[model samples]
Target: AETIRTGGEEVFAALAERYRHELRVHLYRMLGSFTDAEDLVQETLLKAWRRRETFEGRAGFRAWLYRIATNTALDFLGGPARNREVASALAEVSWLQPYPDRLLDLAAPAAIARETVELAFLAVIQHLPPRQRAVLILRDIAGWSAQETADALDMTVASVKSALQRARTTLRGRLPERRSEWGAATEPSAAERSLLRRYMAASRDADLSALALLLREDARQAMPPHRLVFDGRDAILDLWRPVLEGDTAWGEWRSVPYAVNRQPAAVSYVRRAGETLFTAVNVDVLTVVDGLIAEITTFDPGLLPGIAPTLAE
Candidate 1:
């Protein structure tokens, strides 16, 4: 803290870098976009540098950084490009990105280990107004006092408490009812790893029969930024049937197992008719329940680098 106050550029840079990962995690929770979180953590550090003179140590250095981070995230969310209307489902969250568990490891385990950073939690929190969302994360996830939250968001302590309650109410109403049963665990259990392995193998083999056994009867499949949602096992199968079979099939498929948002996922690759190499396709982040796939959120493979290293060329 004292070094940050009196040190030169190197001192400030080192100190700020130490919090970069955690701050990015916090901002990811705020904005629900890993890409946006990466950008904003840099912006947060830059802003902190510009305002470094104000660091009189009243708040701890981490708190000061968080204050800047929360405000910076709010500013981004308030911009015109942001989706103002709250998302009612994961399908509605156009900006949602699967946070790599690898990147999440940068933060202390306790912060990323909980359900607060899970996809379901992140999606539901988007329902709150920006300030209300901030209050909830700060008060609960960040473990800040009401006074600390009030200070960060510039609301009275009573108002902070009120916003927190409202936020909690909204989250309770919107979040998946069964989230508590199994969703809170940070990493996939060994049983889940086996389930994911079978899922990848079934997808790669285009064995719809095997895949069917892995899916729950009421399974849901959604591709974000596309409004279409396939509800139930049959509907989802019908959608996959075309690409996985028949003369109209796109090509041979391959699947690489990956983890995102602490859930099992697979990066699909394809080799078209004439192409020799299997190129990247898409990311399917699965939500499993009772050893079966309950939901699969498929994201475009444009995010390949963030989630995986270079693929087979």
Candidate 2:
């Protein structure tokens, strides 16, 4: 404790740096935007440094940093109220973005695991009022006690408990029913890895038969930032027909596969009849159940960048 105060800013920085990745993941879980979380983490460290004297270390350094990070996320979420209603589906949230599994691996494995950071969880939490969301993240995800959460969010312990209860109730109603089976997996299962490869190949080749075989009968696809959803395998296949075949087809397709949010995903690139270079089109994050695609969430290509360099013909 004494060393922390007199050890200069360098020592404080070192201590804070240890929790950077974990803190960012917390913010990411809150905001559902990787870049926004990155920005807020920087802002959090800066705020913590400026207010370093306030650290009496009662809650401990890691907790102190989390309090700062959580509030930083709250402030960002609080700005410019648009639509705060509980979404009926993930597609309604326009600001949702995929987090790269590579960067997520930097955090404490137990802290992030898979189920907590999965897209479904992140999207469902966005429905809560921002403050309520904060309460849930702190209590459930961060494993903070009611008092600890209340202290961090500046709410009464009773309110913290109340908010968590309401948040849990909402989640129970909104989250997928198979959540328990998803487990705390930190990496893609071998089956998932193989399925991802096949999904990418079927997509690239525009083989509807192969693609159809990969999707569950009730599979659904949602594209965010655009209120579009294709429910059921037949509906999704119909939506893909024009883009993958026929004279009106967008172009020859290619995809670079990557794991995102602990799920299999790929960023697609397309080349038109006259075009020589394939350009990034969109990112598709899959939800797999029983080795078949149960859901797909697609985002604009800009959500992830720099993966298309080697995707030429």
TM-score on alpha carbons, each prediction = 0.93, 0.93
User: Per-residue alpha-carbon lDDT of model 2 for 63-145, expressed as tens digits?
Assistant: 98899999888777777543544553578877778878898888872535777888888889988888988899888888899
In model 2, the Cα lDDT at residue 291 comes to: 88
Q: Per-residue lDDT of 1-313 in model 1, one digit per residue for the tens? A: 6654556666787888888888988998888888888899999999998898878887778999999999998998889536654743777777788887777777762537637666777877878888998999998888999999998898899999899998989888677676563656778778888998998887678888998998999998877656557899999898888888888788887788777788888898888887877877779888887899988888887753454433564
* Overall lDDT per candidate, in order of appearance: 0.81, 0.83
Model 1 spans with C-alpha error above 4 angstroms: 109-111, 178-184, 303-313
**Model 1 poorest 10 in a row by lDDT:** 304-313
Q: Give the C-alpha miss distance for residue 2 in model 1, angstroms.
A: 2.8
Clash pairs, model 1 backbone: none
TM-score of 2: 0.93
